[PDB]
Amino acid sequence: AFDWDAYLEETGSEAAPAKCFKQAQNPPNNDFKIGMKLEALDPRNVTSTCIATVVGVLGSRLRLRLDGSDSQNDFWRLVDSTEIHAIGHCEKNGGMLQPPLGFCMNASSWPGYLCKILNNAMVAPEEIFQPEPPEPEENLFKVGQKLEAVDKKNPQLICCATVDAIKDDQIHVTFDGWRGAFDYWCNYRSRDIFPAGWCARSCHPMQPPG
What we know:
By secondary structure, the protein is of the alpha+beta class. It has helices at residues 4-10, 89-92, 110-118, 198-202; strands at 37-42, 45-58, 61-66, 75-78, 84-85, 146-150, 158-167, 170-175, 184-187, 193-194. The protein is elongated and about 60 Å long. This is Polycomb protein Scm. Scm associates with the PRC1 core complex containing PSC, PC, PH and Sce/RING1. Forms homotypic and heterotypic interactions. Interacts with the SAM domain of ph-p via its SAM domain in vitro. Interacts with corto in vitro.
């Protein structure tokens, strides 16, 4: 557990208040189990809803892999992400499930594939999907404020970071102790940013400065 209070004191810094973040006040409970299947937007084509399997769990997050793709493009979503849903959600809403971009077979072999993978599948029930947190009405972040941020190049990691700059709805996230190597701009509504102390509260590891 990272001593944020000691760190903010020695850097003469403030943590961005919880109200800046599109995150729940308390980290949402994670009742997902490894092997559970669900529907997720394909990160390599966000127009597509695909079958994903929980291949890992960490704090309030899921490590997801798209069925019939590869093991090199896993992605992490919170249990209260709006990009994941129970199986049947897509169809209920007028849509069709799609093959993943990295599908390992040919596209005509898709309809049969879906039947095979969904057959007697472990499915995440709709009740363990958590409600989407309320979002801030404006960008409340201020330059100099510290927070916890996902390293988008190594998304298993959530790290000590600082808001470097602000342009309207975008904040510039810099990772303390890492000389701008994996900084990024993101919307203030990002699900990849958390208030200081959130990881400890959710039983997710939190990386100290580089």
